[PDB]
Amino acid sequence: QKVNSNGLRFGINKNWISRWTANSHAQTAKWLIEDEKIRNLFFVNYRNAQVSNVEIERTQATVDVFVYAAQPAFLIGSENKNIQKITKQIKQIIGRTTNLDLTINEIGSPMLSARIIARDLANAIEARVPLRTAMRQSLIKVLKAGANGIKVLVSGRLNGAEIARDKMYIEGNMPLSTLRADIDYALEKAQTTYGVIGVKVWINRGMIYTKGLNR
Amino acid sequence: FEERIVKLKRISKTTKGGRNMRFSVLVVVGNRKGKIGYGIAKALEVPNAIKKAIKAAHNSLHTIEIHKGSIYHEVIGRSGASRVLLKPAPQGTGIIAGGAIRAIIELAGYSDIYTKNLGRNTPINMIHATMDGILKQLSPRRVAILRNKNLNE
Amino acid sequence: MGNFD
Amino acid sequence: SLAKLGEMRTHVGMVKRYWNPKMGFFIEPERKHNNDHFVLELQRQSLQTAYNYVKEVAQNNGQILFVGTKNDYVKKLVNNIAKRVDVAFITQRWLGGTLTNFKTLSISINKLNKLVEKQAENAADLTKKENLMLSREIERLEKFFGGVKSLKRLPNLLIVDDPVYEKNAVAEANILRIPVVALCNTNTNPELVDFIIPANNHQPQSTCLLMNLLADAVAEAKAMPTMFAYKPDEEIQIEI
RNA sequence: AAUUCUUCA
RNA sequence: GGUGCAUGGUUGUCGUCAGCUCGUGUCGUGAGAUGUUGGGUUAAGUCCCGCAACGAGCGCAACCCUUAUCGUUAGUUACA
RNA sequence: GGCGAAGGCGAAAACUUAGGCCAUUACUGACGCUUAGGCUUGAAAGUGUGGGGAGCAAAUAGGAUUAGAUACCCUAGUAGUCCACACCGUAAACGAUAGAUACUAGCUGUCGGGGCGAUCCCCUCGGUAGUGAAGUUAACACAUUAAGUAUCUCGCCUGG
RNA sequence: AUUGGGCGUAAAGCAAGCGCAGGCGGAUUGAAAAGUCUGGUGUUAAAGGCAGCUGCUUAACAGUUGUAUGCAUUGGAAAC
């Protein structure tokens, strides 16, 4: 029906979430498939540290990964056994003939990233919590930080079959036709006994038009 | 304030494509001591409609006093072709009325009163009939002022 | 409302 | 006394047989000439009571609103009163929902103040096209808010030039608890206005006399000299 | 001139 | 393998048609109306005017790329 | 616009005949209201008896269009549409509002009477109009010519 | 539908009119007492309905005390 807002601005406002290159198209497919594994690993096995996003910076026979989150604490742990652990699951996907340096950092004012919003909504929905209170608390909390409008909606079975009441909330200013508004998007799946629930979140982090070109 | 709600409807306007399901709510508010009011509102979701109804009910309050805990005369609520008869009750016997009217007259601050509906059973017009029946009454001090007598003898 | 004080 | 009966040389007169008989009590016996003249003692009493009420509301540090919106004349009268003696005024049409709700107008007046302050601070640091657009927006905001930019709360009292032409405004005023006063034409209800002032509204000169007298009523309470202050003489000013 | 459109919500 | 009459995501379509609504307020005992009405110009609920409506959101215009002008930087694997 | 209780009533005149309006210093003295049963009328179609057929046209014929057309279209075409003597007693016989009575804001038209008296202007009495508060009705809407406050009596209504 | 509904559009105003009977009905004055007001007398079986009390291991119940209501007769006043 409607096009995604994140993709349209790739390369004109934002930069690629992964920055890499190789020779002609003979192993670049392997490049994508092998960095996709860690990309989905950081999102699947860690849903308790609220990672904002992952940046893959891997060059010829090297690898660097910058990661941003809000509580890196569970990523590292209190005694650094997790960092050796994370290094190892990085190892079997990257190989045994390359370095494995990496770093995790804190994102300033994390309550503006759509990824943690989607994770919070998924966690709330999966535990059979009233949807109304969930969206209301999430919307009020995110708007408390101070920004433009938020577009959060849910689709799927809500405590019953024959869904005809997918809720949709919108406030502030949400211009999708604007070629750039720094409106980040996230899509997440909440797995409940009533099938899959799709949560879509749009977060607007101010206006940047008529100023600057990249980040 | 106790903020009790009564029967809610399920209404929907019709446009091109499906139907705009947007139900309405009605509510009565009172402090059980003499100040009471009622309101009706509509919205897309339950909490918003409830809050709007509470606001529109609570800003539009009106005053009524308590005579020994009950009404001392009979009133016939007559509005929208819906009569309701109110007859005085003794010092105390227990509240007797219809559910909606039960809430209406309990939240006003009365002990007990004789109540019986007539005609239709539509809650909104029933509440309006209760309102104009309870409001248009007059006090013994009123007749004392307008008649040439100090005290009603 | 003759008075206003 | 204020508005001496001698000054009432040309104050009475009404349209031919368009009247609510509820003004039969506040009028002379029905004249055959279809221009029912008025009773001077009651209008004097009512004007004095309005004088005292305005004195009291001004003493208690209140604000009064002036509305005047006839064809060409009364708007000019209200404009001249406004620029002559300070008073809250509305020169253009009263908008539906202007007294019963304030937030929808509080936002507008605050935006007007903020952008006019910016325009004062804007010394052509922006483009000329955008400056002209902003000036046009300021004119748009001011042409409906000619005088409501200095008061930030509801008005305690106000006058109406014609109750049958501020019907929405007077209805909203009666919805709220604040009293109102007006030049009550003999075609209204003796309940829509708390202080009845019967007078003409299509004859410019009587409206001039009464608007000036009420402006003086609010002015002399401001420690400001006035001209109708128990002055037995009068003035000559005519429409054209 | 100018017609009909199978039950079930 | 079944269940798109359980779905998420995605897509067609009306359709790049221009409409779809909300906060507050007013009128009607009600569903609702009022804004979105009307007069003009545009492709456009774009804008203006008056108007019991005051404001607000999405959508459309806009800001992006490309072609058509020229200047500036650069000179090869063009130019010669 | 008017008249008649209703249906209805519009070329002219002759005779008889119905009711109403305005003012009454005139007269009797409540003889007034309503109406079960009863009696009189009652658009239009129609029947019986005796006449007339100009036009119009149920039924019927043919010609058109349509798959069908025993219909809308056309040309023919009879009863009937008239009068006189009898009957039928039905209609959305509607103002979808029974009759009678007094009271309850206003404003602007048209008509008959009387007064002032050139029509055209004013007042007074009655009917027919339009717009309109209170009041009322479910709203639409009524509203001095009530569907308002009320009184008197008849008939009628109780899910399809 | 006496306390307790309607007949413009939801069922219901007969097509209209003349009207016997019946019902309703202006004001003064006296009388009358038919209704209407009302003192007294007599009666309305018991049980049961109701209000107190006693007893059955206690209510169930049984008993006891009192309890309205209508009607005749008689004496008084005359707003309608």
XYZ file of N, CA, C and O (backbone and C1' of nucleotides) in Angstrom, chain G residues 5 31-41 93 96-98 139-140 147 154-158, chain H residues 1 5-27:
336
model
P -73.659 27.006 4.812
O -72.594 25.835 4.992
C -71.940 25.625 6.234
C -71.652 24.162 6.454
C -70.999 23.434 5.292
O -69.596 23.626 5.234
C -72.823 22.165 6.081
P -83.578 25.960 28.480
O -84.390 25.844 27.115
C -83.770 26.138 25.872
C -84.787 26.451 24.806
C -84.226 26.869 23.455
O -83.828 25.768 22.656
C -85.994 28.323 24.087
P -82.615 25.926 21.616
O -81.483 26.657 22.464
C -80.626 27.619 21.869
C -79.257 27.588 22.497
C -78.429 26.348 22.201
O -77.743 26.434 20.963
C -78.420 26.752 24.525
P -77.578 25.134 20.035
O -76.391 24.323 20.719
C -75.092 24.885 20.839
C -74.160 23.952 21.568
C -74.130 22.521 21.050
O -73.273 22.364 19.933
C -74.373 22.503 23.400
P -73.819 21.695 18.579
O -73.588 20.136 18.800
C -72.328 19.639 19.222
C -72.476 18.386 20.045
C -73.147 17.210 19.350
O -72.267 16.482 18.512
C -74.120 17.516 21.476
P -72.628 16.264 16.961
O -73.584 14.989 16.960
C -73.078 13.703 17.286
C -74.052 12.919 18.128
C -75.201 12.250 17.388
O -74.811 11.026 16.786
C -76.038 13.382 19.285
P -75.879 10.078 16.040
O -76.027 8.839 17.029
C -74.873 8.173 17.520
C -75.218 6.914 18.275
C -76.249 6.003 17.628
O -75.727 5.201 16.583
C -76.806 6.294 19.891
P -76.361 5.296 15.109
O -77.901 4.944 15.317
C -78.314 3.604 15.541
C -79.801 3.498 15.789
C -80.717 3.970 14.672
O -80.852 3.041 13.610
C -81.490 4.832 16.719
P -80.945 3.563 12.091
O -82.037 4.727 12.136
C -83.427 4.427 12.161
C -84.272 5.678 12.153
C -84.156 6.558 10.919
O -84.957 6.095 9.845
C -84.021 7.899 12.865
P -84.385 6.094 8.344
O -84.578 7.597 7.855
C -85.867 8.191 7.807
C -85.775 9.692 7.716
C -84.952 10.236 6.557
O -85.677 10.287 5.342
C -84.303 11.317 8.553
P -84.921 10.064 3.941
O -84.120 11.422 3.709
C -84.804 12.618 3.372
C -83.848 13.762 3.141
C -82.686 13.488 2.202
O -83.023 13.526 0.827
C -81.872 14.543 4.134
P -82.282 12.531 -0.194
O -80.882 13.237 -0.488
C -80.793 14.351 -1.364
C -79.667 15.279 -0.984
C -78.305 14.924 -1.558
O -78.124 15.416 -2.874
C -78.097 15.301 0.762
P -60.385 12.526 -1.517
O -61.630 11.791 -0.847
C -62.071 12.140 0.458
C -63.363 12.918 0.409
C -64.022 13.211 1.746
O -63.447 14.324 2.407
C -65.643 12.407 0.227
P -54.271 17.894 4.207
O -55.004 16.564 4.691
C -55.045 16.213 6.071
C -55.949 15.031 6.316
C -56.072 14.600 7.774
O -57.373 14.061 8.004
C -55.139 12.837 6.503
P -58.607 15.028 8.372
O -58.187 15.687 9.759
C -58.433 15.016 10.991
C -58.309 15.941 12.176
C -59.277 17.124 12.198
O -59.620 17.424 13.550
C -57.057 17.924 12.211
P -60.835 16.659 14.275
O -62.116 17.097 13.439
C -62.961 16.126 12.843
C -64.381 16.258 13.332
C -64.745 17.595 13.952
O -65.030 18.590 12.986
C -65.546 15.843 15.321
P -39.818 16.658 19.516
O -39.311 17.470 18.238
C -37.967 17.368 17.784
C -37.899 16.782 16.398
C -38.485 17.642 15.284
O -37.554 18.578 14.766
C -39.387 15.465 15.145
P -38.060 19.940 14.079
O -38.902 19.460 12.811
C -38.260 18.943 11.654
C -39.245 18.293 10.711
C -40.311 19.207 10.127
O -39.848 19.943 9.007
C -41.326 17.230 10.934
P -56.406 22.431 16.101
O -55.109 21.668 16.628
C -55.194 20.701 17.671
C -53.825 20.271 18.150
C -52.904 21.402 18.599
O -52.055 20.933 19.646
C -51.920 20.261 16.781
P -71.154 11.123 25.316
O -71.163 11.060 23.725
C -72.385 11.100 23.006
C -72.150 11.113 21.516
C -71.336 9.958 20.958
O -72.101 8.778 20.783
C -70.551 11.994 20.048
P -71.427 7.338 21.015
O -70.429 7.175 19.785
C -70.928 7.012 18.468
C -69.828 7.083 17.441
C -68.668 6.119 17.625
O -68.955 4.808 17.173
C -67.830 8.270 17.142
P -68.223 3.545 17.845
O -66.692 3.718 17.435
C -66.293 3.647 16.074
C -64.882 4.138 15.873
C -63.788 3.341 16.560
O -63.463 2.150 15.867
C -63.394 5.657 16.857
P -62.938 0.865 16.675
O -61.397 1.179 16.920
C -60.553 1.545 15.839
C -59.173 1.912 16.318
C -58.538 0.945 17.301
O -57.985 -0.191 16.663
C -58.239 3.163 18.066
P -58.402 -1.666 17.138
O -57.230 -2.083 18.131
C -55.870 -1.920 17.746
C -54.928 -2.100 18.910
C -55.141 -3.363 19.743
O -53.876 -3.862 20.175
C -55.323 -1.457 21.129
P -58.348 -0.239 32.031
O -57.281 0.933 31.859
C -56.991 1.817 32.937
C -57.201 3.262 32.554
C -58.461 3.552 31.739
O -58.997 4.815 32.129
C -56.561 4.286 30.544
P -55.136 9.195 31.456
O -54.446 8.889 30.055
C -53.044 8.688 29.964
C -52.634 8.232 28.586
C -53.041 9.137 27.437
O -52.161 10.236 27.275
C -53.533 6.885 26.894
P -52.567 11.472 26.333
O -52.295 10.933 24.859
C -52.884 11.565 23.733
C -53.137 10.581 22.618
C -53.970 11.099 21.458
O -53.183 11.822 20.526
C -54.723 8.937 22.110
P -53.826 13.009 19.657
O -54.722 12.251 18.583
C -54.138 11.405 17.603
C -55.175 10.935 16.618
C -56.142 12.005 16.133
O -55.618 12.742 15.040
C -57.348 10.070 16.796
P -55.039 14.229 15.242
O -54.262 14.511 13.882
C -54.885 14.278 12.627
C -53.984 14.649 11.478
C -52.804 13.721 11.233
O -53.169 12.599 10.447
C -52.076 15.980 11.197
P -52.604 11.138 10.790
O -51.181 11.094 10.075
C -51.055 11.200 8.663
C -49.603 11.228 8.258
C -48.726 10.177 8.928
O -48.722 8.947 8.225
C -47.727 12.311 9.164
P -49.691 7.745 8.669
O -48.741 6.758 9.484
C -48.140 7.164 10.705
C -47.761 5.978 11.556
C -48.902 5.303 12.301
O -49.628 4.401 11.487
C -47.074 5.633 13.767
P -50.942 4.900 10.712
O -52.085 3.919 11.224
C -51.881 2.517 11.288
C -53.008 1.859 12.034
C -54.236 2.728 12.248
O -55.077 2.799 11.110
C -53.659 1.674 14.279
P -55.599 4.225 10.584
O -56.583 4.720 11.733
C -57.729 3.959 12.083
C -58.475 4.579 13.240
C -58.867 6.037 13.075
O -60.036 6.208 12.292
C -57.933 5.700 15.223
P -59.981 7.049 10.924
O -60.090 8.567 11.393
C -60.976 8.953 12.440
C -62.024 9.924 11.958
C -61.490 11.137 11.205
O -62.470 11.566 10.260
C -62.586 11.856 13.171
P -62.670 10.784 8.867
O -64.235 10.478 8.819
C -64.929 10.009 9.972
C -65.790 8.810 9.656
C -66.905 9.058 8.644
O -67.086 7.897 7.837
C -67.840 8.317 10.686
P -66.945 8.007 6.240
O -67.161 9.560 5.947
C -66.089 10.383 5.507
C -66.604 11.673 4.924
C -67.550 12.471 5.811
O -66.880 13.294 6.750
C -68.515 12.229 3.681
P -67.626 13.761 8.095
O -68.741 14.783 7.593
C -68.381 16.044 7.048
C -69.552 16.727 6.386
C -70.742 17.050 7.275
O -70.551 18.205 8.073
C -71.515 16.073 5.277
P -71.203 18.282 9.541
O -72.755 18.511 9.263
C -73.211 19.716 8.667
C -74.628 19.595 8.158
C -75.711 19.426 9.212
O -76.089 20.658 9.803
C -76.066 17.894 7.438
P -76.765 20.688 11.261
O -78.227 20.105 11.025
C -79.208 20.848 10.316
C -80.559 20.182 10.388
C -81.009 19.753 11.775
O -81.566 20.812 12.533
C -81.327 17.967 10.269
P -80.845 21.298 13.884
O -80.949 20.037 14.852
C -82.019 19.913 15.777
C -82.757 18.610 15.601
C -82.628 17.621 16.749
O -83.543 17.884 17.798
C -82.166 16.517 14.718
P -83.274 17.309 19.274
O -84.392 16.189 19.456
C -85.762 16.489 19.245
C -86.637 15.289 19.501
C -86.420 14.582 20.831
O -87.044 15.220 21.930
C -86.435 12.980 19.116
P -86.217 15.456 23.289
O -85.823 13.985 23.766
C -86.821 13.066 24.185
C -86.273 11.669 24.351
C -85.195 11.484 25.409
O -85.709 11.401 26.726
C -84.536 10.391 23.426
P -84.982 12.185 27.927
O -83.491 11.622 27.916
C -83.196 10.322 28.409
C -81.721 10.015 28.317
C -80.788 10.987 29.022
O -80.681 10.736 30.413
C -79.979 10.558 26.844
P -80.462 11.953 31.440
O -78.989 12.471 31.125
C -77.855 11.666 31.412
C -76.600 12.245 30.810
C -76.273 13.677 31.198
O -75.644 13.782 32.464
C -76.078 13.446 28.863
P -75.945 15.049 33.408
O -75.195 16.255 32.685
C -73.783 16.249 32.539
C -73.301 17.394 31.683
C -73.720 18.788 32.122
O -72.952 19.303 33.192
C -74.067 18.567 29.802
P -73.675 20.079 34.399
O -74.239 21.412 33.729
C -73.435 22.579 33.644
C -73.895 23.500 32.540
C -75.026 24.460 32.880
O -74.597 25.610 33.590
C -75.492 23.413 30.824
P -75.646 26.465 34.461
O -75.020 27.932 34.489
C -74.347 28.453 33.353
C -74.398 29.961 33.316
C -74.896 30.653 34.576
O -73.903 30.753 35.582
C -75.921 31.621 32.674
P -74.298 30.569 37.128
O -75.086 31.906 37.492
C -74.400 33.141 37.629
C -75.347 34.275 37.940
C -76.263 34.078 39.138
O -75.619 34.369 40.365
C -77.502 34.936 37.308
